[PDB]
Design a protein around this ligand. Sequence first.
Ligand SMILES: Cn1c(=O)c(Oc2ccc(F)cc2F)cc2cnc(NC(CCO)CCO)nc21
Length: 345
Amino acid sequence: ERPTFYRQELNTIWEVPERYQNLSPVGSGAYGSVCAAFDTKTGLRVAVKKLSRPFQSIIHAKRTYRELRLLKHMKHENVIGLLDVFTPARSLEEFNDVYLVTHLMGADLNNIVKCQKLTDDHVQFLIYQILRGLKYIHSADIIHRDLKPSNLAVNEDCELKILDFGHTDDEMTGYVATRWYRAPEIMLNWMHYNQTVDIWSVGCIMAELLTGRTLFPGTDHIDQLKLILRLVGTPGAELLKKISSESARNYIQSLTQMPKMNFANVFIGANPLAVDLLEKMLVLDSDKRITAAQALAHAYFAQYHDPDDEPVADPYDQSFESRDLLIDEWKSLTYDEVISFVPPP
Ligand SMILES: Cn1c(=O)c(Oc2ccc(F)cc2F)cc2cnc(NC(CCO)CCO)nc21
């Protein structure tokens, strides 16, 4: 049955089912503003995202469909999930707004690191959960592509969820956290990239949790690359071949060759098992990076690793990605997905 909706001006008029009370602006998220609220039906504190102009263009309509598809698929402890999706619309003809509901999270990882070192046990637990969530995400052939501490949310008990999985040129420019966790092959568009871009990001995050400091705080793309290459060495012939961009490969070759540094001398005092994992994650050749599944079985996570409690995802059909459709067709697909939603247990 259709719930009763009530109206409220927040951020824009918000029209939500009565179950959602005490709506309070919480800021911005991916492609829309977020409100905290109390779900009287479940007793949960929730985050409610209203999408801004979900169907104003083909790009927007497809993006709307994409986010809804991704959130409906994800059913994992360490990945943001969909508690509810609703529209005040009674039909496709009047359908123009989409609201997404998930758990309200207490803080992001930026708030926790706060210029300070975490204990080795904290790093173990936090990275373990990230890799557990990434194993799940990657098993569905989904790539986050933009993992960073601000996308990693935690509750009081340090229970972690990954948000915003699956940025303009300007916001990737300069001394910005938006670029600091990006694998070099995506930062400078070396090649058709895969899942392991996210493992690079995990290495950057893990090192930051260990030192309290940004691993590669480049002032720009070029500065960041030099920072990266100083640690991991300049690419060898083998990797150079795989750089399908003639232009990028040519620039790479202009740089003075540097050997990989000793990670034990970079990360003084750190668990040698942590050092070892960082070495396996922060490999320039993405083909050779440790995967999430492999990293979970690494000795560093001995006290958390359970092969029987690290689930994979159901198959995720993303054939729509290569599909060209009109606005109203993307809208109709989105509508179907809203209508068909079944709330989690
Ligand atoms: C920033 N942000 C979102 O963009 C966000 O996006 C959504 C995704 C899917 C969805 F169905 C609904 C959403 F709102 C959810 C969300 C939940 N908790 C929190 N809590 C934050 C504390 C700030 O009060 C800390 C983590 O940033 N922030 C969120």
